[PDB]
Specification:
The complex is a heterotrimer of chains A (826), B (374) and C (32).
Chain A (H helix, E strand, L loop, with lengths): L3 E7 L6 E5 L8 E6 L2 E7 L4 E8 L4 E7 L8 E6 L3 E10 L2 E11 L13 E4 L5 E5 L4 E6 L10 E4 L4 E7 L7 E8 L2 E10 L4 E4 L5 E2 L6 E4 L7 E4 L4 E5 L2 E5 L9 E6 L6 E6 L3 E10 L7 E12 L3 E8 L2 E6 L4 E6 L10 E7 L7 E5 L8 E6 L6 E7 L3 E7 L3 E8 L4 E12 L5 E3 L10 E4 L4 H4 L11 E11 L5 E6 L4 E9 L8 E8 L10 E9 L2 E10 L3 E7 L2 E6 L2 E7 L5 E5 L9 E5 L2 E5 L4 E8 L4 E9 L4 E6 L4 E6 L3 E7 L6 H4 L2 E8 L4 E6 L15 E8 L4 E6 L2 H17 L8 H5 L1 E2 L4 E2 L4 E3 H5 L6 H7 L4 E3 L5 E3 L2 H12 L3
Parallel strand pairs in A: 1-62, 38-40
Antiparallel strand pairs in A: 1-59, 2-3, 3-4, 4-5, 6-7, 7-8, 8-9, 10-11, 11-12, 12-13, 14-15, 15-16, 16-17, 16-18, 19-20, 20-21, 21-22, 23-24, 24-25, 25-26, 27-28, 28-29, 29-30, 31-32, 32-33, 33-34, 35-36, 36-37, 36-39, 39-40, 41-42, 42-43, 43-44, 45-46, 46-47, 47-48, 49-50, 50-51, 51-52, 53-54, ...
Chain B lengths: L9 E6 L12 E6 L2 H12 L3 E9 L4 E18 L2 E18 L8 E8 L14 H4 L11 H5 L1 H11 L10 H5 L3 H15 L4 H4 L4 H11 L4 H9 L3 H13 L3 E4 L6 E4 L12 E5 L5 E7 L5 E8 L8 E8 L5 E8 L8 E6 L3 E4 L17
Antiparallel strand pairs in B: 1-6, 2-5, 3-4, 4-5, 5-6, 7-8, 7-15, 9-10, 10-14, 11-12, 12-13, 13-14
Chain C lengths: L7 E2 L6 E2 L2 H12 L1
Antiparallel strand pairs in C: 1-2
The complex binds S-Pomalidomide and zinc ion (2 copies).
């Protein structure tokens, strides 16, 4: 019933994995990067990185590890997707035609099985005898590495330890041995098991259960000379090997958790460790020959090299160069100098690869062309937080504005030629009583500055005290220039005040354009917020002044400009305020809902409301009555991340396991019961987590109306930096394109032989249905990149209609013209 | 053992005509059967699946029901009581259902075509957005299980900070995700249940949120028509959030014995002395009364004349007050002796006689229905 | 009636009664 088209405007930029090895040829060194559904292959040169091949998979890359089996020229690549599609890929080049051929594949999902708390863990034995996968608690799946195993037939092994944290395959063992840290009611422990492929079961490990630290989170197998393994926790780093057990508690690692590692020297003498706050350390393992040549670990040392981007993964390339794979910020290439610099750091940045990072909010603005729109996003988190202005070339051109603090919400104000941005910075509790900042950020380095006057809650405050060292986030409304992007003004909110919503509009008869902010007073003892405000600000003469302030009984989660009035949402209530002649908000309506009004979107007199559990609700303001009325709803429990009104009857949303869905106002409805239900009319597994939906387009709006094939345009921002676009089609165009997708799938070569139908099928841990009411634009647009006989095969015995009449045999040149028209929407 | 049907499956099961009260999955249903058709029907069920339907009536007079619960028989015994031969049976609530058809047989017993409503179980709200690097930090190093240490909000602060760290990648804060967290929601209920009445928490309530949510839905002091709302909810998260809303909406107090009489509202509570609104006072015979002071109270009858003998609030005379319906003792009406006294007339209610409840709107002038939140 | 002054009193709540029988009934209600 809904006919939609979805396409990628910007591919996912956030790096979730990186591995080095010899994938292309045994001689040259490669770096493989996993950017969610994309896989980039580079060659490591003395200058930097040389791009060799980039491929797209029909699946979110969960595991990615290289390995060289016995009797193979170069390394093979094992990949596992989020939907459990396992595959062994090989790099094959013929003259100037590069192709990633699928040596073996198969789905490794188990119908019945509770997925693990620590997610998917995929490891390979150092001698390539097997691939060990930990997908579900209580079971260890084993895919034996035999030349006969092409479908990836595997068997599960009963594991008595339910809560396994991390697991690795040990080096220098007679039989394949796994080492893992797990938790039980007596705390955390490290245990080993020998994996028998003949018996298809576990055997006694070389060194049975050993007690580890309370927060033991990482396991690292050490190569042949040393042997054994390194277990990293919060306060300590310990090395275990048979009888010996050395443990060190260096104070330099206590301030933050080590969340990623990488081997530097192939013997295991050096390792790179990265914490949550961007620090980079060097873990060194001192050796001891011991006459006979057994070689034992003498000592462990940790050295702080310096600061990088918040690293998700790390990988030592060569000659002091390390690739810093980041999710919250830009990924990098950094040089590790033997001697430090004047500041004391041993790290020096070489390249900075742009990452649109977690796009938490965004907006579309014209800015300078006065016709062509540009997209301004709230990107990254913490020191990696920034703004990004994405625009078309007229390829996408990106301009970065670093903030050094977390940006949260963004809106534009044309009247004052500037942007309003809600943002938060982390400060630490000082001995003196007050708080101290970590680094100088956008809110601390503002030209004009101000603090909110405590009136409402200065008197009405709960009794409590904050202890030394505790972190506290400081919220600010930043006024940023549209041209220079300098922080013109920074307004700090009250103590314990969390700023949630932000709008820029004209209310009532008032000709001034105000920046309205919705907040919530967040105390730790108080679970659900019972206090908040709506602050009306006016930016003029380089200063921000508080026009009005309205106290509320809850958290102002969302606000929208509603026909010259302010529509706000306080917890379960959806309230309508009117802007009086005395310049104050006055309540006109209230609507008490069965859900928490988190998501608030509007179209004319219609109001779309939604909560975190995908409870969708459609209200309507009755003007003659002067109150709200519920039109329809659809409550199916599932996690919802964003929502939007496509047209008067259709509503788009983003629900659990990276899916997109469309709800529709039931037509041909006789009964009130059926009129009051929104029918699910479209489902599609996007493979990205949407945070913001935004009406607009990044292409020339087109002055003269020349029969557009697509109607409407909704852009969207995701956690991986991917930007997509959604649009509506006609029944004829949909049925054509749908038939086209199924023809395209027969001729297109999928990496890992994963089915497109299976990939885009709506999926959750409980239910998995096929995709409906959605045309895969990435698949349709790939038609222009294919070869003329494959186009001839796709258009073979296919009927194309150009409108009104002439329903003739479709040709590749007619279809090329149609797909070329679709590529112009982004 | 245990007989369980498939999710969203269509089944036809019998309905015992004597039954009427709502049965929540997990809670037990004791039955006393006298009529041979009821006994014979139950004896057949023992040989078959041992399961029958318990309809959740909207109106028991007209026998109107849209949902219900399958009841599995786990105990049968042919007893004798008061010179009457009666069979006693115990059943336990299992699956929830939506009523499709209610065909009535030749006997008083009726069959019921029903669709099994599934138990919605969702993963952690952060499961999707969690960083691979931070997956290993998601696990906690055991519970503090020291009443004082977990009642202290410093542990729940550490829990929130760790579990919902990746809320920074999303458009919402950590504290919002806690409002849809099973463990946090259970703890909030436990704390408010202890606030209502002092009791042993470890023994009385289960650790599982599915089991916990049902246990609470059965024990809440509410109307069975309101209870249907909890039966309709399929997600234990939504079920717990709804229970906390119901709990927060119990702003009135009623006769614990009959529960048909709204005595007073929390708004009428007031502090006469600096001790507090509620305080324990002993009478001249050693009976201790935890007494709540309220400005106004109603649905009470006064017994005898006022007396100043051993008054707990000097300057006032007590008059014994009892429930208009069941005559159970609710407390006393304190009436001032002098004209210069501040409240002049107030009420001292005994805590043990009262029970929390949602303010009823029996008047047909403005009956605004209770709108529960998920 | 019985005794106008209400000499029969309840030790639990102070409820006075005109006849002993009424007090006995009253004290049975405290048991529940
Ligand atoms: N004189 C008697 C005799 C028997 C029982 C009671 C009293 C009496 O005064 N109270 C309460 C009534 C309420 C009060 O204010 N103070 C009391 O001690 C009793 O329960
Ligand atoms: Zn009563
Ligand atoms: Zn008494």
């Amino acid at each position: 019933m809904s006919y939609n088209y979805v396409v990628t405007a910007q591919k996912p930029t956030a790096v979730n994995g990186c591995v080095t090895g010899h994938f292309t040829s045994a001689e040259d060194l490669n770096l493989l990067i996993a950017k969610n559904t994309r896989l980039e292959i580079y060659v490591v040169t003395a200058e930097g990185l040389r791009p060799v091949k980039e491929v797209g998979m029909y699946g979110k890359i969960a595991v990615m590890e290289l390995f060289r089996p016995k009797g193979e020229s170069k390394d093979l690549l094992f990949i596992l997707t989020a939907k459990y599609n396992a595959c062994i890929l090989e790099y094959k080049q013929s003259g100037e035609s590069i192709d990633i051929i699928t040596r073996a594949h198969g789905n490794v999902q188990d119908r019945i099985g509770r997925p693990s708390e620590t997610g998917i863990i995929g490891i390979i034995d150092p001698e390539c005898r097997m691939i060990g996968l930990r997908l579900y608690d209580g079971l260890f799946k084993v895919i034996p590495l035999d030349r006969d195993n092409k479908e990836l037939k595997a068997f599960n092994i009963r594991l008595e330890e339910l809560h396994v944290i991390d697991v690795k395959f040990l080096y220098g063992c007679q039989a394949p041995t796994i080492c893992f840290v797990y938790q039980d009611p007596q705390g955390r422990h490290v245990k080993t098991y020998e994996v028998s492929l003949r018996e298809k079961e576990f055997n006694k490990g070389p060194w049975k259960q050993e007690n580890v630290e309370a927060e033991a989170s990482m396991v690292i197998a050490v190569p042949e000379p040393f042997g054994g393994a390194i277990i990293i926790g919060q306060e300590s780093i310990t090395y275990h090997n048979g009888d010996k057990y050395l443990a060190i508690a260096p104070p330099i690692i206590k301030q933050s958790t080590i969340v990623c590692h990488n081997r530097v020297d192939p013997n295991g003498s050096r390792y790179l460790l990265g914490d949550m706050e961007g620090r980079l350390f060097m873990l060194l393992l001192e050796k001891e020959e011991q006459m006979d040549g057994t070689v034992t670990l003498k000592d462990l040392r940790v050295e702080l090299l310096g600061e990088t981007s918040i690293a998700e993964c790390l990988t030592y390339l060569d000659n002091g160069v390390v690739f810093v794979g980041s999710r919250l910020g830009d990924s990098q290439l950094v040089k590790l100098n033997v001697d430090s610099n004047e500041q004391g750091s041993y790290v020096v940045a070489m390249e900075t690869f742009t990452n649109l990072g977690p796009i938490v909010d965004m907006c579309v603005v014209d800015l300078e062309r006065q016709g062509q729109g540009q997209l301004v996003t709230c990107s990254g988190a913490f020191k990696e937080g920034s703004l990004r202005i994405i625009r078309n070339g007229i390829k996408l051109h990106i301009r970065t504005v670093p903030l050094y603090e977390s940006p949260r919400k963004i809106c534009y104000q044309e009247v004052s030629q500037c942007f309003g941005v809600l943002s938060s910075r982390i400060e630490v509790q000082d001995t003196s009583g007050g708080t101290t900042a970590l680094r100088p950020s956008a809110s601390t380095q503002a030209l004009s500055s101000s603090v909110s006057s405590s009136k409402l809650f200065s008197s009405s405050t709960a009794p409590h005290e904050t202890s030394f060292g505790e972190e506290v986030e400081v919220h600010n409304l930043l006024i940023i220039d549209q041209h220079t992007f300098e922080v013109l003004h920074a307004h700090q909110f009250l103590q314990n005040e969390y700023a949630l919503s932000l709008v820029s509009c004209k209310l009532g008869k008032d000709p001034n354009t105000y920046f309205i902010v919705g907040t919530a007073m967040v105390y730790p003892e108080e679970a659900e917020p019972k206090q908040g405000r709506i602050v009306v600000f006016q930016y003029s003469d380089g200063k921000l002044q508080t026009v009005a302030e309205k106290e509320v009984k809850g958290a102002v989660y969302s606000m929208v400009e509603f026909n010259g009035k302010l529509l706000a949402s306080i917890n379960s209530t959806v309230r309508l305020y009117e802007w009086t002649t005395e310049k104050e908000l006055r309540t006109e309506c209230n609507h008490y809902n069965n859900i928490m009004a988190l998501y608030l979107k509007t179209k004319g007199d219609f109001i779309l409301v939604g909560d975190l559990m995908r409870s969708v609700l459609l209200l309507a303001y009755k003007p003659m009555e002067g109150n709200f009325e519920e039109i329809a709803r659809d409550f199916n429990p599932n996690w919802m991340s964003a929502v939007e009104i496509l047209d008067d009857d259709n509503f788009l949303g983003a629900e659990n396991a990276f899916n997109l869905f469309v709800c529709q106002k039931d037509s041909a409805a006789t009964t009130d019961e059926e009129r009051q239900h929104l029918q699910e009319v479209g489902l599609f597994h996007l493979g990205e987590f949407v945070n913001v939906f935004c009406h607009g387009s990044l292409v020339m709006q087109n002055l003269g109306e020349t029969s557009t094939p697509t109607q409407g345009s909704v852009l969207f921002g995701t956690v991986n930096g991917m930007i997509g676009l959604v649009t509506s089609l006609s029944e004829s165009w949909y049925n054509l394109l749908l038939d086209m997708q199924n023809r395209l799938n027969k001729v297109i070569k999928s990496v890992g032989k994963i089915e497109h139908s299976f990939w885009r099928s709506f999926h959750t841990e409980r239910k998995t249905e096929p995709a409906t009411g959605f045309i895969d634009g990435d698949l349709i647009e790939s038609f222009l990149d294919i070869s003329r006989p494959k186009m001839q095969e796709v258009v073979a015995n296919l009927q194309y209609d150009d409108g009104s009449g002439m329903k003739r045999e479709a040709t590749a040149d007619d279809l090329i013209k149609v797909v070329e028209e679709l590529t112009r929407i982004h | 053992g245990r007989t369980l049907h498939d999710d969203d499956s269509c089944q036809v099961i019998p309905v015992l005509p004597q039954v009427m009260m709502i049965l929540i999955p997990g809670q037990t249903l004791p039955l006393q059967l006298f009529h041979p058709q009821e006994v014979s029907m139950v004896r057949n069920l023992i040989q078959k699946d041992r399961t029958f339907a318990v309809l959740a009536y909207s109106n028991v007079q007209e026998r109107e029901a849209q949902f219900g619960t399958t009841a599995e028989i786990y105990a049968y015994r042919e007893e004798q009581d008061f010179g009457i031969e009666i069979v006693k049976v115990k059943a336990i609530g299992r699956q929830r259902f939506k009523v499709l058809e209610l065909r009535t047989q030749s006997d008083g017993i009726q069959q019921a075509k029903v669709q099994i409503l599934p138990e919605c179980v969702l993963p952690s709200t952060m499961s999707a957005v969690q960083l691979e690097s931070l997956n290993k930090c998601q696990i906690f190093p055991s519970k503090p299980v020291s009443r004082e240490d977990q009642c202290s909000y410093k542990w729940w602060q550490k829990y929130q900070k760790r579990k919902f760290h990746c809320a920074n990648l999303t458009s919402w804060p950590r504290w919002l995700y806690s409002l849809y967290d099973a463990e946090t929601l259970m703890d909030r209920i436990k704390k408010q249940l202890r606030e209502w009445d002092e009791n042993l928490k470890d023994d009385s309530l289960p650790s599982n949120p599915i089991d916990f949510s049902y246990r609470v839905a059965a024990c809440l002091p509410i109307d069975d028509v309101l209870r249907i709302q909890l039966l309709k909810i399929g997600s234990a998260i939504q079920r717990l959030r709804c229970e906390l809303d119901i709990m927060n909406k119990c702003t009135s107090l009623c006769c614990k014995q009959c529960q048909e009489t709204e005595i007073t509202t929390k708004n009428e509570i007031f502090s006469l002395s600096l001790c507090g609104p509620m305080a324990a006072y002993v009478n001249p015979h050693g009976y201790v009364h935890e007494t709540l002071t309220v400005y106004k109270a109603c649905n009470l009858n006064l017994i005898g004349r006022p007396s100043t003998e051993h008054s707990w609030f000097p300057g006032y005379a007590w008059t014994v007050a009892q429930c208009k319906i069941c005559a159970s003792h609710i407390g006393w009406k304190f009436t001032a002796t002098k004209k210069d006294m501040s409240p002049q007339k107030f009420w001292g209610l005994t805590r043990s006689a009262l029970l929390p409840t949602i303010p009823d709107t029996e008047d047909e002038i403005s009956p605004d229905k209770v709108i529960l939140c998920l | 009636g019985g005794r106008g002054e209400r000499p029969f009193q309840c030790n639990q709540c102070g409820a006075s009664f005109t006849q002993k029988g009424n007090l006995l009934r009253h004290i049975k209600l405290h048991s529940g």
